[PDB]
Design a protein around this ligand. Structure first.
Ligand SMILES: *CCC(=O)N1CCC[C@@H](n2nc(-c3ccc(O)cc3)c3c(N)ncnc32)C1
Length: 272
C-alpha cells in the first residue's frame, strides 16, 4: 500500500513523480507530473517531534479506515522513504475559519445547513463504524472546496480547545457541543467567548453562563435555532444522541434541499 497513488485510476508512482507547488498555510500542494492532477501532501519527517508524529499517524489511521465516508478527507496514497513519510490526500479549498475571515461577516444559514448535515454524519460514522470520537470539532477542522464538498479533516487526538462540552470539563456526545459553538461562531461572525483572556476563563463561562444561543433578529429559521439549542444542552444526558440528531427537522431540510455551495465558495474565494 506504499508507492501507489489512486486519484479509479491507480498509478505506481514515487515521491519525485510530484511537483512541489508550495506550502499551504507541513502540508504541500503538489502536482502529479504524469497526468497533471493537483493533490495535497503532508510530510512527516522521521526526526520530527515524537508527539506530533504520533498524532499524524493516528489521523492517517482513521482516514484510511474511512475510505467509504463521503464527509471525510480521502487519502490517495502513501510514500515511505528512509527519512520521511508522505501522505497524499484530496486537495480541498480552505477551512471554515478562513472562510469566515474572508467573508468579514456572518456565513449564510443555507451554507451552514449543508455544513451541519455533513459534520453530524461524519461524527456519526466515526462512532458507529469505528467507535471513534473526534474531540476537537471547530471551524478550522471543516474543509470546503470548489466543488461544494464539506468534510471533516483532523483526527489527530481522536479517541476510541475552547469548544469543550460541559461534561468534558466536569465529568459520548461531547462533539455535539463543539459543533454548536462552531455554528454560533460561523452564523454570527463572532466567537461567543472572545472577551476571555485565558483558557480557564473560557471553561468557567461554559459552566457558569447560559448556553450561547443564536440571536433572534438575524432571520434565522426556527429549525436552525432549535438545532443549536439542542447541541448546546449543558447536561450531556439530555443532549440527544446522533440517532436523534439525524432526525432533527434542520437536518432533514438540508438533506433534500439543493444549495449551491460551490458557487458561494467561489464567490467568497474571489473576494479579498
Ligand atoms: C483551516 C485550514 C488551514 O489553515 N489549514 C492549515 C494548513 C493546511 C490546511 N489543509 N490541511 C489539510 C489536511 C491535512 C491532513 C489531513 O488528514 C486532512 C486534511 C488539507 C487538505 N487535504 N487540502 C487542502 N488544505 C489542507 C488546513
Amino acid at each position: 500500500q506504499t508507492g501507489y497513488l489512486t486519484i479509479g485510476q491507480r498509478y505506481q508512482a514515487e515521491i519525485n513523480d510530484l511537483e512541489n507547488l508550495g506550502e499551504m498555510g507541513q502540508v504541500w500542494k503538489m502536482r502529479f507530473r504524469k497526468t497533471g492532477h493537483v493533490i495535497a501532501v503532508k510530510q512527516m519527517r522521521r526526526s520530527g517531534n515524537k508527539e506530533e508524529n504520533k498524532r499524524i499517524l493516528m489521523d492517517l489511521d482513521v482516514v484510511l479506515k474511512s475510505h467509504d465516508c463521503p464527509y471525510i478527507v480521502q487519502c490517495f496514497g502513501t510514500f515511505i522513504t528512509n527519512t520521511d513519510v508522505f501522505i497524499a490526500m484530496e486537495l480541498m479549498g480552505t477551512c471554515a475559519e478562513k472562510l469566515k475571515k474572508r467573508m468579514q461577516g456572518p456565513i449564510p444559514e443555507r451554507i451552514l445547513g449543508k455544513m451541519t448535515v455533513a459534520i453530524v454524519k461524519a461524527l456519526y460514522y466515526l462512532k458507529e463504524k469505528h467507535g471513534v470520537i473526534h474531540r476537537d470539532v471547530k471551524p478550522s477542522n471543516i474543509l470546503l472546496d470548489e466543488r461544494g464538498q464539506i468534510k471533516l479533516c483532523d483526527f489527530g487526538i481522536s479517541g476510541r480547545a475552547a469548544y469543550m462540552a460541559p461534561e468534558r470539563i466536569d465529568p459520548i456526545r461531547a462533539d455535539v457541543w463543539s459543533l454548536g459553538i462552531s455554528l454560533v461562531e460561523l452564523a454570527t461572525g463572532q466567537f461567543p467567548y472572545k472577551n476571555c483572556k485565558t483558557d480557564f476563563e473560557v471553561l468557567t463561562k461554559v459552566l457558569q453562563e447560559e448556553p450561547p444561543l443564536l440571536p433572534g433578529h438575524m432571520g434565522f429559521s426556527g429549525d436552525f435555532q432549535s438545532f443549536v439549542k439542542d447541541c448546546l444542552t449543558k447536561d450531556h444526558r439530555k443532549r440527544p444522541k446522533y440517532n436523534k440528531l439525524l432526525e432533527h427537522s434542520f437536518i432533514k431540510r438540508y438533506e433534500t434541499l439543493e444549495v449551491d455551495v460551490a458557487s458561494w465558495f467561489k464567490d467568497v474565494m474571489a473576494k479579498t
